[PDB]
Design an enzyme around this catalytic site. Structure first.
Site, short mmCIF file in Angstrom:
data_model
loop_
_atom_site.label_atom_id
_atom_site.label_comp_id
_atom_site.label_asym_id
_atom_site.label_seq_id
_atom_site.Cartn_x
_atom_site.Cartn_y
_atom_site.Cartn_z
N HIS A 18 1.09 -1.29 0.05
CA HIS A 18 0.17 -0.14 -0.05
C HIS A 18 0.86 1.24 0.19
O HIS A 18 0.33 2.32 -0.30
CB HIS A 18 -0.83 0.02 1.20
CG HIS A 18 -2.14 0.63 0.99
ND1 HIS A 18 -3.14 0.09 0.58
CD2 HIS A 18 -2.66 1.77 2.03
CE1 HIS A 18 -4.20 0.80 0.54
NE2 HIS A 18 -4.16 1.67 1.25
N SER A 20 -0.57 -0.45 -6.01
CA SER A 20 -0.45 -1.39 -7.39
C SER A 20 0.17 -1.11 -8.35
O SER A 20 0.13 0.31 -8.66
CB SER A 20 -1.89 -1.61 -7.84
OG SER A 20 -2.58 -2.70 -6.83
N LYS A 44 -15.60 -5.23 -11.08
CA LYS A 44 -14.77 -6.12 -11.94
C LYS A 44 -14.51 -7.33 -11.42
O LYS A 44 -14.38 -8.43 -12.09
CB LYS A 44 -13.53 -5.33 -12.30
CG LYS A 44 -12.95 -6.00 -13.75
CD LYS A 44 -11.73 -4.91 -14.02
CE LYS A 44 -11.12 -5.58 -15.41
NZ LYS A 44 -10.15 -4.59 -16.02
N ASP A 45 -14.24 -7.47 -10.07
CA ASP A 45 -14.01 -8.59 -9.50
C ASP A 45 -15.10 -9.74 -9.30
O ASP A 45 -14.80 -10.86 -9.43
CB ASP A 45 -13.43 -8.30 -7.97
CG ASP A 45 -11.74 -7.85 -7.86
OD1 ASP A 45 -11.06 -7.90 -8.84
OD2 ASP A 45 -11.52 -7.13 -6.86
N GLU A 61 1.02 -34.03 -5.63
CA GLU A 61 -0.10 -33.25 -6.20
C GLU A 61 0.30 -32.51 -7.50
O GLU A 61 1.59 -32.28 -7.24
CB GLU A 61 -0.84 -32.62 -5.03
CG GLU A 61 -1.40 -33.69 -4.24
CD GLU A 61 -3.16 -33.38 -4.33
OE1 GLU A 61 -3.33 -34.30 -5.19
OE2 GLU A 61 -3.62 -32.64 -3.85
C1 HEM Z 1 -3.11 -16.17 -0.26
C2 HEM Z 1 -1.99 -15.71 -1.44
C3 HEM Z 1 -2.36 -14.27 -1.67
C4 HEM Z 1 -3.28 -13.41 -1.71
C5 HEM Z 1 -4.58 -13.53 -1.23
C6 HEM Z 1 -2.70 -12.26 -2.30
C7 HEM Z 1 -3.61 -11.26 -2.60
C8 HEM Z 1 -2.92 -10.08 -3.39
C9 HEM Z 1 -4.10 -9.10 -3.51
C10 HEM Z 1 -5.44 -8.84 -3.22
C11 HEM Z 1 -3.31 -8.07 -4.20
C12 HEM Z 1 -3.77 -6.78 -4.77
C13 HEM Z 1 -4.39 -6.98 -6.20
C14 HEM Z 1 -3.86 -7.70 -7.18
O1 HEM Z 1 -2.82 -7.39 -7.85
O2 HEM Z 1 -4.03 -8.81 -7.41
C15 HEM Z 1 -1.89 -8.66 -4.41
C16 HEM Z 1 -1.12 -7.90 -4.97
C17 HEM Z 1 0.26 -8.73 -5.03
N1 HEM Z 1 0.91 -9.84 -4.63
FE1 HEM Z 1 -0.50 -11.15 -3.84
N2 HEM Z 1 -1.37 -12.59 -2.80
C18 HEM Z 1 -1.03 -13.64 -2.37
C19 HEM Z 1 0.11 -14.62 -2.91
C20 HEM Z 1 1.11 -13.89 -3.37
C21 HEM Z 1 2.27 -14.50 -3.86
C22 HEM Z 1 2.58 -15.90 -3.55
C23 HEM Z 1 3.13 -13.36 -4.09
C24 HEM Z 1 4.31 -13.21 -4.58
C25 HEM Z 1 5.36 -14.51 -4.84
C26 HEM Z 1 2.54 -12.23 -3.97
C27 HEM Z 1 2.78 -11.02 -4.72
C28 HEM Z 1 2.11 -9.93 -4.81
C29 HEM Z 1 2.61 -8.66 -5.53
C30 HEM Z 1 4.01 -8.55 -5.83
C31 HEM Z 1 1.33 -7.87 -5.46
C32 HEM Z 1 1.42 -6.68 -6.20
C33 HEM Z 1 1.61 -6.83 -7.46
C34 HEM Z 1 0.80 -5.51 -8.36
O3 HEM Z 1 -0.04 -4.77 -8.18
O4 HEM Z 1 1.78 -5.18 -9.05
N3 HEM Z 1 1.15 -12.72 -3.88
N4 HEM Z 1 -2.01 -10.06 -3.80
#
Ligand code: HEM
Ligand SMILES: CCCCCCCCCCCCCCCCCC(=O)OC[C@H](COP(=O)([O-])OCC(O)COP(=O)([O-])OC[C@@H](COC(=O)CCCCCCCCCCCCCCCCC)OC(=O)CCCCCCCCCCCCCCCCC)OC(=O)CCCCCCCCCCCCCCCCC
Ligand SMILES: CCCCCCCCCCCCCCCCCC(=O)OC[C@H](COP(=O)([O-])OCC[N+](C)(C)C)OC(=O)CCCCCCCCCCCCCCCCC
Ligand SMILES: CCCCCCCCCCCCCCCCCC(=O)OC[C@H](COP(=O)([O-])OCC[N+](C)(C)C)OC(=O)CCCCCCCCCCCCCCCCC
Ligand SMILES: CCCCCCCCCCCCCCCCCCCC(=O)O[C@H](COC(=O)CCCCCCCCCCCCCC)COP(=O)(O)OCCN
Ligand SMILES: CCCCCCCCCCCCCCCCCCCC(=O)O[C@H](COC(=O)CCCCCCCCCCCCCC)COP(=O)(O)OCCN
Ligand code: HEC
Ligand code: HEM
Ligand code: HEM
Ligand SMILES: CCCCCCCCCCCCO[C@@H]1O[C@H](CO)[C@@H](O[C@H]2O[C@H](CO)[C@@H](O)[C@H](O)[C@H]2O)[C@H](O)[C@H]1O
Ligand SMILES: CCCCCCCCCCCCO[C@@H]1O[C@H](CO)[C@@H](O[C@H]2O[C@H](CO)[C@@H](O)[C@H](O)[C@H]2O)[C@H](O)[C@H]1O
Ligand SMILES: CCCCCCCCCCC1=C(C)C(=O)C(OC)=C(OC)C1=O
Ligand code: FES
Lengths: 54, 71, 85, 55, 383, 244, 75, 124, 165
Positions: free
Chosen positions: I92, I96, I118-119, I162
């Site tokens: 934050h 994004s 959109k979600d 798996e």
């Molecule tokens: C339980 C697993 C996860 C949840 C619920 C989650 C949820 C989210 C959400 C809601 C966002 C902001 C919206 C979006 O960009 O899609 C986000 C952004 C991000 N997530 Fe995840 N995430 C998870 C796992 C991961 C993993 C495994 C990675 C990296 C290896 C990761 C890296 C990021 C990054 C770098 C962003 C910012 C991307 C951007 O907006 O440019 N997340 N995540």
């Protein structure tokens, strides 16, 4: 006192090293001390005290 | 023989004599009352449990430590 | 209602000078014996009635209730128990 | 190798053949062919009698 | 800029545990919050550990607890730690709530942390109730039976809800397995609400024993309250040690070492000591539904303290009459606790009713009267 | 409730294990096992105790293996899937006198003798209750008590009528250590043994608690010094106010 | 009372030897002892507590197995 | 409860001869036992301030009164944390216990309550 | 960098969570998968074997292992949710990123209502895929061997993880 401070206390790396090594020594000596004390206050009562009969 | 037999007897005749008397009196009354007819058709039948507990509680107070000392 | 360091939300402060000494310069247990005896006595004396009055009242109430309950379930208390139920 | 149970009498060294990745153990239970690094471990066993062993 | 301030994650920690500005005069009654955090951490560590060795199936539950005591290395410690810390958790929570009521912590601007606090207290009750059932001894079973039957009093749907909660027609295996799952979950929910009440508090900061603003004179949380918290942590650990190592069963009921038997009813079914005041309040009302409402109301009435306290001053430090009333209220709450475990016999029946009336009249009559009068005495007295 | 409905409260006896720093007397434990084995085991099980539990508490490894090997336990079925018995092992649990509750009750005029593994923790009183109960059968019930059929008067038992008769009489056991087996002695030994059976961690627990008490106390003292040291600049603060 | 250059009286609290290495060393001895017991206490706590995850006594009892050999034919 | 309420009720009591005869001595003892003077506070220092109205009244204090209040709060906080009482000149004497804040809050509240009334006016 | 780095840990926590959950069925794949994956720890030099026995709570995968995996499988999703929250809070500070890779500070849209609605489209697309598997083909992604009860003696023909591992 200066010497002691300079070697063991001044650098935190040395202070933490000294504390941990003291904790190791305390742990081993306290174990042995309590073991002996416990055996003396409970003398003739424990298995090790009657074991020889069997 | 059981050390407790003698310790209990000593405590009953000695420090717990008042309680011994009360239990004794109670038993006398209750046995006499049972002897009388139409006892079975009475509303309230007295026991001697209360007095017995008072005596036993007393004996135990005067004996517990002495008994365990000789085991 | 609370800010943060630099703007905590205090009215403007002026005219107070504050002083203190280093923990290494001070005796941490200075005046401990006087405090432990005289300060504790003063503090305790001044709060004693606020503990004593409610505790003593509720302990007396409990004592009376528990003794009566005990008595009602003896042979002597048969009649009073019969009325109570 | 990984921790399957070799099928005995099978193999190519006619002892034990692990079906999982094809490792062949001997009549000594020594590894001869296949991915397995070591010979089949020996437990701590003692002959109390000549007719009973404890493991 | 310092990293602890610059980095957003570090800064959140920093704002709570290091740079957090605190009043400089918090007394030892402000230390129960960190003791409650300690109990919660102990319960999570011991509870998760017990879950590695406990079996929730009714045929195996009681024996899995015996296996923990007898065969698991330090199982006896983990079990007694968990069981005794459940009691310590309630001692600390009553102390913490008592502190809050005496020092007016429920007044504006701290209504929200207090209101969330009331829910934390309800979650603790449910958590502890379910965990007690898990042993599946006689008190476990019979306690679950009588407490879950109170739900039958809900009109129209009450019986249906009870059968739904049980997953059958009596407390049995389905009930035990669901209580295990919920008992595992509830502490996590509780930790979230504990966090929420702190975040809500952080807008006003901690109150203090004088009841005035501390915005004039703040101290960092660390090192001052860090090191002050250690004293009570070690005091707590000494008390913990005396129970867990020297008297591990003093706070429990022997009947819970008898395996649950739906046929034999125990001589007396009483709750754990910390629920006893609420049980006394329930017994006081003759009606079943009345009693349940009263019992719940006894907790929810805490929500109206911000309204019924009419004082222009926060807290009791300078209010001699309020202090006396608080003393009577607390002692009455302990009497209710005692009456919760006596037999339903004369003269405890009537005494329980009087104590229950006093409990509610504190909130509804006495505190509003006393706080009104003291307002007038402060004003006239200082003219 | 009446005192009878509660049961008489047992005296507090000076047990060897009473005392923050005291272990069980293991010689008494051994003797108490022999009372269990020769008297109580006729009617009462001890199902939570395995042979291995006795080893290094009351008996040597060899003595306990000998006890195990004298019994027969259910083996896994043979190759034709027929049932088999084997001799006992140290991992086996001490076997009970009856196959089920119904058999137990049938042998005891309807009463079910409880398992004794937890009985010292499952009754208010612990060892004192067990000792008081076993030694507290009066020769005659107090005048006026009507016992139900198959009941015996014992004031320590709530209600007074217990379905277990007196079982300990002078010399029902011959102790292997030469101790005079009086009613009192046997009751004390068996109460000690059963207390051990309920809480076998007792000795280790109390010694670890001694270590905890010492360390925690030292840390409490040092935490007071450190708090006072760190707080002294705040406590010692002084002000001069000159109104603007 | 008025001048801010006249420091308030701190004589009841001031140590004469406040600037010496001995003085500092003492307070570090207290801090260090406390760290030492906290380290020893944590080590004991961790070791005893985590040992719950090592094989329990009943699992250790199920190890040594006896097998006959008379039943087993050649080959 | 509002300062307005407290002040009005108190004035009703002070009017009634009977009432004042029995209330004023009680109120004076209450204040002595309250013990806030032993921490060098004035009564008005204890009034809850975390309210919009009270924040406004405090902002309207003359600078001198404001600076002195800050000092009394800091000094009382120091006595609290040390577990000491005021001695000598730090004790508030009854003649120094002046209602410095009451006039400001009564004005703030007067406007706030008039505003509420006039928000509910009905043209006749 | 920080939300991404925390993300890498979230991914490891997901792997461990899902691994432990799979063991809980205690079919053949459950047991043999646990055996092979937990034996990889034996490769840690010096202490590896001791660590494996410690993890198992015995000398092979058995009851102690299953009960501990249940407890940890229950816990790990809560840990994972905390880290998921941490990576969002870390994000934050920059906000994004976007498909062009430039700053969006010039042109921002509220999360609601635009991305809320959109979600929903992808939520319903996901639920349709979920429905097709759960109602019409519930076992397509699984291994038949996991419907055979764990047997420490018999080794399955092939032990594979798996698909996602
Ligand atoms: C339980 C697993 C996860 C949840 C619920 C989650 C949820 C989210 C959400 C809601 C966002 C902001 C919206 C979006 O960009 O899609 C986000 C952004 C991000 N997530 Fe995840 N995430 C998870 C796992 C991961 C993993 C495994 C990675 C990296 C290896 C990761 C890296 C990021 C990054 C770098 C962003 C910012 C991307 C951007 O907006 O440019 N997340 N995540
Ligand atoms: C459970 C887990 C264990 C952890 C223990 C944590 C408990 C610590 C705590 O909160 O209480 C310590 C606490 C000492 O805390 P403190 O920060 O020095 O002062 C807090 C009081 O507001 C200060 O009250 P005060 O300055 O007015 O002093 C009053 C106190 C004297 O307090 C002294 O310690 C002296 O004595 C009494 O009130 C006793 C009543 C008379 C009975 C006769 O003890 C009390 O004052 C208890 C008074 C309650 C009645
Ligand atoms: C038992 C009855 C308690 C009466 C308390 C009355 C005040 C008193 O003397 O306490 C000392 C002290 C007095 O402290 P104080 O802050 O009022 O005064 C300090 C001294 N002066 C005034 C000079 C600044 O009170 C406390 O510290 C009270 C904390 C209350 C905690 C109660 C826990 C009970 C749990 C029930 C939950 C529902
Ligand atoms: C529980 C874990 C305890 C670990 C003890 C290892 C040494 C750390 C310690 O006691 O604190 C010393 C150190 C430093 O204490 P310190 O901050 O008083 O020392 C700094 C000043 N010198 C180095 C000159 C003495 O603490 C830490 O570094 C933090 C670890 C806390 C434990
Ligand atoms: C066993 C548990 C207690 C053991 C840990 C205490 C620290 C041991 C000694 C280390 C020490 O004193 O050094 C300080 C570290 O303390 C710290 O940084 C922490 C201070 C106190 C430790 C814990 C704080 C408790 C507060 C809340 C309790 C929560 C309970 C809930 C689980 C740094 O000294 P310094 O930082 O003052 O400066 C001094 C110059 N660097
Ligand atoms: C989780 C529950 C928390 C409560 C801890 C109380 C003591 C538990 C440990 C068991 C114990 O009795 O330890 C004794 C020593 O006491 C001690 O020294 C322990 C008292 C220490 C109190 C505070 C120290 C840290 C506690 C929490 C830190 C956790 C962080 C890392 C785990 C025995 O000693 P032993 O012989 O059994 O010891 C083995 C190495 N010789
Ligand atoms: C031949 C029968 C028999 C023998 C021998 C026997 N018991 Fe019992 N015992 C019972 C029965 C039956 C009960 C259940 C009594 C009842 O519930 O009315 C019982 C109950 C008990 C109770 C529990 C009483 C309660 O509070 O519920 C204890 C403790 C006890 N026995 C211990 C012993 C000990 C110790 C021994 C011998 C050293 C022993 N028993 C020998 C038949 C026996
Ligand atoms: C798991 C239970 C709880 C934890 C861990 C917890 C923790 C804390 C902590 C650390 C604080 C700040 C320090 C302190 O004042 O002690 C605090 C403050 C507070 N808590 Fe709790 N609390 C818990 C339950 C409750 C409950 C049940 C209530 C109310 C019914 C409550 C109401 C408050 C209030 C009102 C404050 C602010 C008090 C003040 O500083 O003036 N909390 N809590
Ligand atoms: C606020 C936190 C908690 C409280 C107040 C609490 C309370 C309790 C209580 C009162 C018991 C009955 C104990 C007994 O007499 O034996 C218990 C048992 C249990 N709890 Fe918890 N608990 C908490 C957290 C947890 C957590 C997080 C777990 C994780 C699974 C857990 C697992 C267990 C288990 C498995 C038992 C049954 C074994 C036993 O009785 O010791 N608990 N708990
Ligand atoms: C107590 C357990 C320890 C973990 C901390 C709890 C985690 C949850 C905390 C985050 C919730 C948001 O909490 C909020 O964070 C920001 C910055 O961190 C704080 O903001 C505060 O500190 C920063 C600098 O330290 C200042 O810019 C700001 O003026 C001030 O209000 C809020 O006062 C706090 O309410
Ligand atoms: C985050 C932590 C990361 C790595 C930490 C690794 C720690 C896990 C190792 C568990 C070690 C237990 O190892 C074993 O512990 C027990 C106590 O627990 C010790 O046992 C010793 O003390 C206990 C009481 O404390 C007595 O019951 C026992 O008779 C005695 O032998 C053993 O002497 C030691 O061999
Ligand atoms: C998981 C949620 C649990 C919340 C509690 C964790 C925080 C640890 C207690 C620290 C503490 C805080 C935050 C605090 O604000 C405070 O000042 C009033 C304290 O000491 C007097 C404290 O001890
Ligand atoms: S597993 Fe045995 S060959 Fe690979």
């Amino acid at each position: 006192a200066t010497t002691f401070y300079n070697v063991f206390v001044k650098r935190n790396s040395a202070f933490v090293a000294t504390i941990l090594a003291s904790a190791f020594v305390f742990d081993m000596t306290f174990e042995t001390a309590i073991d002996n004390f416990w055996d003396r206050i409970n003398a003739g009562k424990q298995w090790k005290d009657i074991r020889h009969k069997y | 023989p059981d050390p407790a037999i003698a310790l209990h007897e000593a405590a009953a005749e000695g420090p717990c004599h008042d309680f011994k008397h009360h239990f004794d009196e109670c038993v006398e009354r209750v046995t006499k009352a049972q002897e009388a007819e139409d006892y079975d058709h009475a509303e309230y039948k007295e026991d001697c449990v209360e007095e017995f507990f008072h005596l036993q509680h007393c004996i135990n107070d005067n004996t517990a430590d002495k008994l365990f000392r000789v085991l | 209602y609370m800010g943060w360091w630099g703007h905590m939300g205090s009215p403007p402060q002026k005219g107070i000078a504050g002083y203190t000494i280093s923990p290494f310069a001070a005796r941490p247990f200075a005046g401990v014996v006087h405090a432990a005896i005289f300060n504790t006595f003063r503090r305790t004396k001044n709060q004693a009635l606020f503990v004593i009055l409610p505790v003593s009242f509720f302990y007396y109430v409990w004592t009376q209730a528990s003794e009566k309950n005990e008595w009602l379930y003896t042979k002597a208390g048969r009649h009073e128990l019969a009325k109570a139920l | 190798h990984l921790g399957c149970v070799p099928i005995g009498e099978a193999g190519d060294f006619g002892g034990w053949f692990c079906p999982c990745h094809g490792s062949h153990y001997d009549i000594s239970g020594r590894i001869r062919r296949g991915p397995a690094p070591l010979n089949l471990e020996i437990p701590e066993y003692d002959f109390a009698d000549a007719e009973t062993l404890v493991i | 800029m310092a990293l602890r301030k610059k980095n957003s994650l570090l800064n959140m920690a920093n704002s709570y545990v290091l740079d957090s500005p605190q009043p400089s005069n918090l007394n030892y009654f402000w230390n129960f919050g960190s003791l409650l955090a300690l109990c919660l951490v102990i319960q999570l560590a011991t509870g998760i550990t017990l879950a590695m060795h406990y079996t929730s199936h009714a045929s195996l539950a009681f024996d899995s607890v015996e296996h923990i005591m007898r065969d698991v290395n330090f199982g006896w410690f983990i079990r007694y730690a968990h069981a005794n810390t459940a009691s310590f958790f309630f001692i600390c929570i009553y102390a913490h709530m008592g502190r809050n009521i005496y020092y007016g912590s429920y007044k504006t601007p701290r209504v929200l942390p207090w209101s969330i606090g009331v829910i934390i207290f309800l979650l603790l009750i449910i958590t502890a109730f379910m965990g007690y059932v898990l042993v599946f001894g006689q008190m476990s079973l019979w306690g679950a039976t009588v407490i879950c039957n109170l739900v039958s009093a809900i009109p129209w749907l009450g019986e249906d809800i009870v059968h739904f909660l049980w997953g059958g027609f009596s407390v049995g295996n389905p009930t035990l397995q669901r209580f295990f799952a919920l008992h595992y979950l509830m502490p996590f929910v509780l930790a979230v609400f504990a966090l929420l009440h702190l975040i809500a508090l952080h807008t006003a900061g901690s109150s203090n024993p004088l009841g005035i603003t501390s915005n004039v004179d703040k101290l960092s949380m660390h090192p001052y309250y860090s090191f002050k918290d250690l004293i009570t942590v070690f005091a707590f650990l000494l008390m913990f040690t005396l129970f867990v190592f020297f008297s591990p069963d003093k706070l429990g009921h022997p009947d819970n070492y008898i395996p649950a038997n739906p046929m034999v009813t125990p001589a007396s079914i009483v709750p754990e000591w910390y629920l006893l005041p609420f049980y006394a309040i329930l017994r006081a009302i003759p009606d079943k539904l009345g009693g349940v409402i009263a019992m719940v109301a006894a907790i929810l009435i805490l929500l109206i303290l911000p309204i019924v306290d009419r004082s222009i001053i926060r807290g009791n430090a300078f209010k001699p009459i309020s202090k006396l009333l608080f003393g009577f209220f607390i002692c009455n709450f302990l009497l209710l606790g005692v009456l919760g475990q006596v037999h339903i016999e004369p003269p405890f029946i009537v005494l329980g009713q009087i104590c229950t009336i006093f409990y509610f009249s504190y909130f509804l009559i006495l505190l509003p009267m006393v706080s009104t009068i003291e307002n007038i005495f402060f004003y006239i007295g200082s003219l | 409730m009446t005192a009878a409905e509660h049961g008489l409260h047992p005296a507090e006896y000076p047990w060897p294990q009473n005392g923050m720093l005291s272990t069980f007397d293991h010689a008494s434990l051994r003797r108490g096992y022999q009372v269990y084995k020769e008297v109580c085991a006729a009617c009462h099980s001890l199902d939570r105790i395995a042979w291995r539990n006795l080893v290094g508490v009351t008996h040597t490894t060899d003595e306990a293996k000998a006890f195990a090997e004298e019994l027969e336990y259910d083996d896994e079925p043979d190759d034709e899937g027929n049932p088999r018995k084997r001799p006992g092992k140290l991992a086996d649990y001490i076997p009970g006198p009856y196959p089920n509750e119904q058999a137990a009750r049938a042998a005891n005029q309807g009463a079910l003798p409880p398992d004794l593994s937890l009985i010292a923790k499952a009754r208010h009183g612990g060892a004192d209750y067990i000792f008081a109960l076993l030694t507290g059968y009066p020769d005659e019930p107090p005048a006026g008590v009507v016992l139900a059929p198959g009941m015996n008067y014992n004031p320590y038992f709530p209600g007074g009528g217990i379905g277990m008769a007196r079982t300990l009489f002078d010399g029902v056991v011959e102790y292997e250590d030469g101790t005079p087996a009086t009613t009192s002695q046997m009751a004390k030994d068996v109460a000690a043994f059963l207390t051990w059976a309920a809480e076998p961690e007792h000795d280790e627990r109390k010694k670890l608690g001694l270590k905890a008490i010492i360390v925690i106390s030292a840390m409490l003292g040092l935490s007071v010094y450190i708090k006072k040291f760190k707080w002294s600049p705040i406590k010692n603060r002084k002000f001069i106010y000159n109104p603007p | 009372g008025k001048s801010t250059y006249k420091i308030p009286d701190f004589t009841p609290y001031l140590k004469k030897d406040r600037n010496t290495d001995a003085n500092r060393l003492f307070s570090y001895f207290m801090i260090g002892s406390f760290g030492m017991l906290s380290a020893a206490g944590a080590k004991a706590t961790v070791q005893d507590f985590l040992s719950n995850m090592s094989a329990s006594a009943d699992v250790l009892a199920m190890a040594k197995v006896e097998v006959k050999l008379g039943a087993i034919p050649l080959g | 409860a509002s300062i307005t309420s407290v002040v009005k009720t108190s004035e009703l009591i002070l009017k009634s001869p009977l009432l004042s005869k029995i209330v004023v001595p009680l109120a004076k003892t209450y204040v002595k036992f309250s013990g806030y003077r032993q921490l060098g506070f004035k009564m008005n220092d204890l009034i809850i301030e975390e309210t919009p109205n009270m924040q406004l009244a405090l902002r309207r204090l003359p600078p001198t009164e404001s600076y002195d209040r800050v000092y009394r709060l800091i000094r009382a906080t120091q006595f609290s944390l040390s577990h000491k009482l005021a001695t000598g000149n730090d004790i508030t004497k009854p003649e120094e216990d002046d209602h410095y804040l009451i006039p400001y809050i009564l004005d703030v509240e007067a406007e706030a309550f008039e505003k509420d009334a006039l928000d509910n006016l009905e043209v006749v």
